[PDB]
Design a protein around this ligand. Sequence first.
Ligand SMILES: [Zn+2]
Ligand SMILES: [Zn+2]
Ligand SMILES: [Zn+2]
Length: 109
Amino acid sequence: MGHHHHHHNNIAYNCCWDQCQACFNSSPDLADHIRSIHVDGQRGGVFVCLWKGCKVYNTPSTSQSWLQRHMLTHSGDKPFKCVVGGCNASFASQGGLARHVPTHFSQQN
Ligand SMILES: [Zn+2]
Ligand SMILES: [Zn+2]
Ligand SMILES: [Zn+2]
């Protein structure tokens, strides 16, 4: 019978992030775009969550480790990659990354 709705009923996980209508059916792919266009997008010294669903969104914070740990809840990545465009560091646990990131955030002061 014509069942083109399929039994594969997977939703496209669209991020509710300010003007990013992007949707991935895979969790890592979603997290990837979060880290790339969301987390890495806020690289102006203050990182803000625009994820509508947070009760603390639209609030810029200089805590790169916190921001990442907050988005961890949203998409669920595993390796935390360096936020610096041009820096490569990835750790499955944030403790190692949380030591690496502030070395770059020694910018000026
Ligand atoms: Zn998005
Ligand atoms: Zn959020
Ligand atoms: Zn780095």
